[PDB]
Amino acid sequence: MDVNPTLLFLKVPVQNAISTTFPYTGDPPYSHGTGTGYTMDTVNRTHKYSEKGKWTTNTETGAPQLNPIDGPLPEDNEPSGYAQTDCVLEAMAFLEESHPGIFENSCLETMEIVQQTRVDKLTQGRQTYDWTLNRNQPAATALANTIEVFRSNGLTANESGRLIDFLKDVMDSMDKEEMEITTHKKKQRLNKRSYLIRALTLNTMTKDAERGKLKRRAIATPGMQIRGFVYFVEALARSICEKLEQSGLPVGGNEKKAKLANVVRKMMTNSQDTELSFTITGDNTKWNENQNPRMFLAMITYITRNQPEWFRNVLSIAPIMFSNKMARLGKGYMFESKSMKLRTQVPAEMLANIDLKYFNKSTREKIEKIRPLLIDGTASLSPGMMMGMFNMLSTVLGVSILNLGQKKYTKTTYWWDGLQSSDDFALIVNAPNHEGIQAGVDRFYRTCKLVGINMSKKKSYINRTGTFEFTSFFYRYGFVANFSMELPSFGVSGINESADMSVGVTVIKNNMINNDLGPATAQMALQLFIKDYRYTYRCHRGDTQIQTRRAFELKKLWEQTRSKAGLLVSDGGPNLYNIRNLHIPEVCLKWELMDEDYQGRLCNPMNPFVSHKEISMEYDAVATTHSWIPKRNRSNTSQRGILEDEQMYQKCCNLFEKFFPSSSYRRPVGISSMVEAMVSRARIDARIDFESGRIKKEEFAEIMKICSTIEELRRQK
Amino acid sequence: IKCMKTFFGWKEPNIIKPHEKGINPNYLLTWKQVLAELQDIENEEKIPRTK
RNA sequence: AUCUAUAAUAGCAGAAG
RNA sequence: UCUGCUUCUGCUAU
RNA sequence: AGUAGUAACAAGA
Numbered sequence: 001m002d003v004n005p006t007l008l009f010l011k012v013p014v015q016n017a018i019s020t021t022f023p024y025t026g027d028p029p030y031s032h033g034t035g036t037g038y039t040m041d042t043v044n045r046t047h048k049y050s051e052k053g054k055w056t057t058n059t060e061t062g063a064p065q066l067n068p069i070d071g072p073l074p075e076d077n078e079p080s081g082y083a084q085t086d087c088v089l090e091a092m093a094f095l096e097e098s099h100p101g102i103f104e105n106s107c108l109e110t111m112e113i114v115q116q117t118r119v120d121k122l123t124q125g126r127q128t129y130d131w132t133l134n135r136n137q138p139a140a141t142a143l144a145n146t147i148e149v150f151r152s153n154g155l156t157a158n159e160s161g162r163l164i165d166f167l168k169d170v171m172d173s174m175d176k177e178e179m180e181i182t183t184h185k186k187k188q189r190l191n192k193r194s195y196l197i198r199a200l201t202l203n204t205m206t207k208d209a210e211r212g213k214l215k216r217r218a219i220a221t222p223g224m225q226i227r228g229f230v231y232f233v234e235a236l237a238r239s240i241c242e243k244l245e246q247s248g249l250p251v252g253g254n255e256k257k258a259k260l261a262n263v264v265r266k267m268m269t270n271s272q273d274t275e276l277s278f279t280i281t282g283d284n285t286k287w288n289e290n291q292n293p294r295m296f297l298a299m300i301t302y303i304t305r306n307q308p309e310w311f312r313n314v315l316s317i318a319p320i321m322f323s324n325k326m327a328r329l330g331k332g333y334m335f336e337s338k339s340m341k342l343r344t345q346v347p348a349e350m351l352a353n354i355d356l357k358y359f360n361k362s363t364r365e366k367i368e369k370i371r372p373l374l375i376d377g378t379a380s381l382s383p384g385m386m387m388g389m390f391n392m393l394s395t396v397l398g399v400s401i402l403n404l405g406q407k408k409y410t411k412t413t414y415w416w417d418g419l420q421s422s423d424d425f426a427l428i429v430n431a432p433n434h435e436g437i438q439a440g441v442d443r444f445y446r447t448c449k450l451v452g453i454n455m456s457k458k459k460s461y462i463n464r465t466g467t468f469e470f471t472s473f474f475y476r477y478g479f480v481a482n483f484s485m486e487l488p489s490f491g492v493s494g495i496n497e498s499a500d501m502s503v504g505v506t507v508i509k510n511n512m513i514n515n516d517l518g519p520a521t522a523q524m525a526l527q528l529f530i531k532d533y534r535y536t537y538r539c540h541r542g543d544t545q546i547q548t549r550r551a552f553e554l555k556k557l558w559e560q561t562r563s564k565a566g567l568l569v570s571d572g573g574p575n576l577y578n579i580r581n582l583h584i585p586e587v588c589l590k591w592e593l594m595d596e597d598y599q600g601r602l603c604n605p606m607n608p609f610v611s612h613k614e615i616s617m618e619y620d621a622v623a624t625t626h627s628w629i630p631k632r633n634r635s636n637t638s639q640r641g642i643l644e645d646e647q648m649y650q651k652c653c654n655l656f657e658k659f660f661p662s663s664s665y666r667r668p669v670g671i672s673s674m675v676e677a678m679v680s681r682a683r684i685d686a687r688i689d690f691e692s693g694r695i696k697k698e699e700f701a702e703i704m705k706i707c708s709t710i711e712e713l714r715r716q717k
Numbered sequence: 718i719k720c721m722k723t724f725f726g727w728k729e730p731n732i733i734k735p736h737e738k739g740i741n742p743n744y745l746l747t748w749k750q751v752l753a754e755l756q757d758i759e760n761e762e763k764i765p766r767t768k
Numbered sequence: 769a770u771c772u773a774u775a776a777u778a779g780c781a782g783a784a785g
Numbered sequence: 786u787c788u789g790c791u792u793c794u795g796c797u798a799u
Numbered sequence: 800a801g802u803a804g805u806a807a808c809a810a811g812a
């Protein structure tokens with residue numbers, strides 16, 4: 001017998017065993033070299049889908065920009081970026097007509113959002129392009145560098161702390177004759193065009209650890225001048241998506257499954273009995289490369305009708321900046337000579353003035369096709385969205401096309417509705433016969449073509465209503481469990497012993513709750529997690545023979561302890577977990593069983609493995625000694641000048657927390673400097689203390705004198 | 718070392734199916750070196766955690 | 769009965785597009 | 786010159 | 800050589 005696992009589908013429906021088809025036990029594919037190839041190929045595809053558009057030269061950056069809007073209607077079924085503005089405006093108008101007041105209410109909530117949001121929001125980002133260094137940096141570091149450069153250039157509206165004031169600072173920065181960068185101290189001066197190109201740049205990197213793809217692709221990260229505007233636009237689009245029944249966003253998880261099930265259920269209820277009902281499991285092809293920023297500007301302009309003009313402007317800036325964006329090419333390439341046995345790095349900035357003899361066929365073609373767009377090591381990319389930068393606005397566009405499917409708009413016997421999550425979509429078509437179904441599908445496809453949406457024909461299929469797939473959720477008369485997708489969440493997390501126990505047990509319990517993890521498999525998952533935990537942390541049961549550096553101390557503690565069942569697993573104790581007590585932490589689970597001296601040692605108030613805060617008297621520690629801190633190795637470049645800046649930053653922040661007790665519980669607000677706030681707090685505290693009677697004459701005088709000394713030092717350095 | 722001692726029947730190693738793109742004498746010498754260093758740190762019976 | 773929300777600390781990890 | 790955006794979920798508290 | 804797969808590793812300073 002030849003074993004064929006796929007033959008199991010001959011009896012078990014594919015949905016009820018979909019977990020088999022997800023091979024998430026092996027490592028995911030990574031990229032190894034540069035991402036310049038994928039970046040250039042993305043730019044060339046974007047300009048190929050819009051090649052019949054109009055070419056112009058940007059008077060501000062000098063970049064060739066392609067405009068495919070209102071271009072010739074497509075003649076074939078290849079992806080097209082030729083969205084018609086009148087069709088997009090009609091889709092918006094009919095979405096507002098079908099849901100009266102959606103855009104007005106969304107604009108009110110977004111006005112509140114825009115007026116209250118702080119600049120600190122921008123620090124909630126991951127790796128960000130930093131134009132001051134022309135490199136990727138943490139979002140908070142990039143924002144701090146931007147604020148420092150803006151301040152040294154006389155731009156200080158961001159001192160208000162509001163995001164919109166920082167956006168005004170960005171707007172004013174885009175009008176300066178020259179930008180001063182002060183490194184460490186080399187004083188560089190960018191001119192208007194160079195600073196402008198750096199401000200409209202999105203750094204490009206290759207996406208790593210991605211399942212389901214044979215070939216790698218490029219992702220983009222914008223700078224700080226783009227992120228605030230994109231945040232405001234995405235907030236407006238999220239407010240809109242929240243009010244739409246077809247939107248699969250921003251709902252996620254169990255709430256998303258419930259919404260999808262209820263909406264599909266209502267759709268099947270609305271469909272009359274004599275009607276034929278079909279469902280398209282549909283993907284859209286080249287979604288981000290055919291989403292035009294000009295159509296996003298049209299959508300925002302229609303959505304913000306009759307709003308204050310400042311609001312329309314601040315919402316219009318993101319599509320404008322994305323219409324004039326530049327894509328940084330990346331790291332370049334690497335060249336090898338076998339005969340000379342040497343290798344060298346060729347930067348991307350010299351890919352326009354390099355000889356094409358060095359490259360293979362396809363890379364030479366890429367460079368030849370992309371050379372007219374190269375400026376300062378970036379490529380002009382007017383069309384496209386550059387990989388999920390306006391997820392919610394493109395969701396709104398897709399939902400508008402879905403909304404165009406009611407019988408009041410089709411004016412025929414067929415109609416359609418469905419679900420839209422950015423690019424993914426489930427389309428339910430109803431019609432009195434099969435010809436009507438075909439006509440409705442053709443009309444939906446062509447209407448999508450009219451707005452720059454291209455249904456992937458090779459990835460989409462259609463069947464009688466009742467089963468479909470939407471955003472990796474498989475629906476067979478109801479959504480099925482897919483446990484494999486949550487498989488990489490099982491294991492030792494690497495935080496510390498306590499946190500790893502908590503995470504392992506909690507993951508097992510939540511997988512029992514959400515992903516149909518059965519009780520026997522849950523017990524076996526518990527056993528496997530305890531094995532992996534004991535291996536990782538060298539904390540095998542005291543009464544064992546495994547030889548490790550920790551085993552002697554564990555044997556001593558084991559033989560020392562009367563009640564062994566109270567010892568934590570990290571202390572070589574037994575595993576008392578079962579299905580009953582997964583929701584209970586480990587220290588609480590066996591608190592009754594602990595020996596008194598072991599319990600008073602594990603939870604000692606003067607625990608030396610956790611940090612202690614001053615009130616040299618300190619607060620008592622509560623955590624156990626298993627909550628230690630892992631050494632983080634961060635030691636070979638020239639970027640070692642920031643280690644001292646960060647150390648002094650930390651010193652200042654600890655002093656501030658000594659003056660402001662709630663600063664680390666909630667984010668502090670204030671336009672005053674740190675010294676001013678701290679001195680005023682010290683003064684008012686000394687006053688209400690001398691008054692209430694905790695300090696005397698002389699201590700109050702001394703505090704007031706030190707405050708006056710600090711204030712004359714801040715005025716007189 | 719103990720599991721190897723359970724086997725009697727060692728011969729002089731010779732190449733039976735060569736690696737057509739490699740240098741096979743290097744593989745023969747690598748196996749001989751593994752045997753020699755095992756005999757070395759066994760003759761010592763001061764067997765470290767790593768050799 | 770409602771409850772992302774008559775709501776907003778932050779970081780990390782998993783998944784999805 | 787190298788883990789982006791968005792959404793959800795879980796854990797933790799420099 | 801090998802890993803690997805559209806570009807890299809097979810140390811670097």
Ligand SMILES: Nc1ccn([C@@H]2O[C@H](COP(=O)(O)CP(=O)(O)OP(=O)(O)O)[C@@H](O)[C@H]2O)c(=O)n1
Nearest residue numbers: 284285286287288289387388389422423456785
């Ligand atoms: N990591 C990710 C994955 C997806 N996305 C967003 O989801 C879209 C569809 O991805 P997708 O992966 O479905 C496109 P694929 O099906 O591979 O190819 P095709 O375009 O030829 O059809 C992208 O264009 C981005 O907007 C993202 O922002 N980050």
Ligand SMILES: [Mg+2]
Nearest residue numbers: 282283424425
């Ligand atoms: Mg789909």
Ligand SMILES: [Mg+2]
Nearest residue numbers: 283284456459
């Ligand atoms: Mg896809």
